[PDB]
Structure formats: C-alpha cells, structure tokens
C-alpha cells in the first residue's frame, strides 16, 4: 500500500496472514466469511464483494441455501419517497425449515414476530439467539454459521461462514 | 373510567421510549408495523402514507 | 419470617383456545406456551394490555378480566353469567 515492511513480518488482512521474505509475500489461501448486505435506498453488495443496484418493487429472495435447505431468507421491497428512483426496504422475512418450518419477520421499526405473534428480546430458543445490540439494532444468530443485523430502517446485513 | 396514573398533559401523546411527543413525531403502526412520522409507502395497486399518527391509505 | 408469603406468578388456562396456557410472571411480564410476548396480543377472544403501562390487563371476552401480578396484586372480574 505504498509503505515498506522489513523482512519476518506478518501482516494480517481480515482473511488471512502474509509474510515477507525474498521480498515476496507468501500466503494462505483458506476460505473466509463474506457478507451480503442491503442498505440506503436499494444498494446490494454480494458475497463475492460485488456492487449493484435494482429498484425493484416485490418480494425479493436474498439468499437460500440451495443444495440443502438449511433456510432462506426473503427481503421485501417498497418505494419509499415521492421519487420513483427511492426504494427502500420494509421487512424481511428469515425461515428456518430445522426449527417447525418457523417463520421469523423482522418488521420496519425494531420489532420481530414469529408466526405473527410478536416477542420480546432476548428469544433463546434451541439454536437461533435475538437480542438487541445497541438497544437499536436486532442481531438474529443461528447456529455459529449465521447472523443478521437491523431491517427497520433497511440496513439488512447477513455473515455466512465458509461451510455454505 | 377516570384512572389514577402517571399521565402527561393533553397536548403530549405517549412514545414507546418513555418519553411522551407531540403527535408531530407520533408514529403509526399499520399492521403493526412502526412507521416513522414521514414514511410514504406504496405496493404497486395501494398508496399509503402516515401523517401525524394515523395511518392515509388509498388505493 | 415465616408470614410473610407472597405471590410470585399465577396462571391461566383457556380449554377453548388451543387449550393454551397464560402465564403472568413477576414483573410485567406474559409468558404463552414458554414463549415471551410483547403487549398487545390480540388474538381471537382474549385481549392483553398494559393498563399505565406498569400493570398487565387479560380480556377474555366481555365476562372475564385480570390485573397485574407482579408483586403480588391479582384481581379478577366475572360477569353473572358464570
């Protein structure tokens, strides 16, 4: 990055670590976790560390687990201004086909609902822990493979582990 | 009836945060959903909007 | 000492509905088949709700009412038909 490092040193990415010698970093190539999120208007970025938009109005997959069924979740999109170029997202919805096929909502302020009844944080269940963050943020987290993060004002985050 | 509590006066309505507002910034809760106090919303067919509290849904 | 016995929790059980089963613990708090619940719960028949946002309040239909049981002051209401 434009700055020296003597030889024996390790410097650590977020991924892995990297060590100087022969003036050639050697690396690891072992699998990390990515992240999908949603946030602003209708601004995506991918698992792969890609960027898009689409102002779509419906309800939208935004990922699943597709050779087994572990779950799925579904993001729901809605204008949300006087423009047609401002769609914001409302709610999604999280499933988990392990525990009664439940179906979990986290809705537009900071609440959640399962099976429409709505719950108080914390929610230990077996598997899957909600509770706030901030006391303005939900965390969902299922299993150790699995986390979420805030859809009331639509900053959905995901962190999937490199076993999926 | 006519309760005993702990009230606010006639112009501050209750906030879910203890405190009590104006209904300026009193939210709705359209299908239970907390909408802030300027949320315009719409499906593709309906047309909806919260105001002041209430919930001005068209279609 | 020893009278001095207060009451912690109490529950409620409705045969016509899912034939579930209401707990109210001791704070302010409603506990539905183990699961906790945030105020209101309208289902069908029984409404829940705080009162002063300090004291829960069942409804269960128009002949039955409750009261907060969190330290300890339980009511209730019934109706002439029962």
């Known amino acids: ?164 | 009836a006519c309760l005993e509590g702990c009230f606010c006066p006639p112009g501050l309505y209750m906030d879910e945060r203890g405190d009590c507002v104006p209904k300026a910034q009193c939210p709705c809760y359209y299908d239970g959903e907390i909408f802030q106090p300027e949320d315009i919303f719409s499906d593709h067919h309906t047309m909806c909007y919260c105001e002041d509290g209430f919930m001005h849904c068209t279609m």
């Open chain 1, 1 to 164: 990055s434009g700055k020296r490092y003597p030889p024996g040193t390790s410097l650590s990415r977020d991924c892995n670590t990297c060590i100087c010698r022969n003036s050639q970093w050697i690396c690891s190539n072992e699998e990390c976790p990515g992240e999908c999120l949603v946030t602003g208007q209708s601004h995506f970025k991918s698992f792969d560390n890609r960027y898009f938009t689409f102002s779509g109005i419906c309800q939208y997959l935004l990922a699943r687990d597709c050779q087994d069924h572990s779950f799925s979740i579904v993001i729901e999109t809605v204008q949300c201004a006087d423009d047609r170029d401002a769609v914001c997202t409302r709610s999604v919805t999280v499933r988990l086909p392990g525990l009664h096929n439940s179906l979990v909502k986290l809705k537009h302020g900071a609440g959640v609902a399962m099976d429409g009844q709505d719950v108080q944080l914390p929610l230990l269940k077996g598997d899957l822990r909600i509770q706030h963050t901030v006391t303005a943020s939900v965390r969902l987290s299922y299993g150790e493979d699995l986390q979420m993060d805030w859809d009331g004002r639509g900053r959905l985050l995901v962190k999937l582990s490199p076993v999926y």
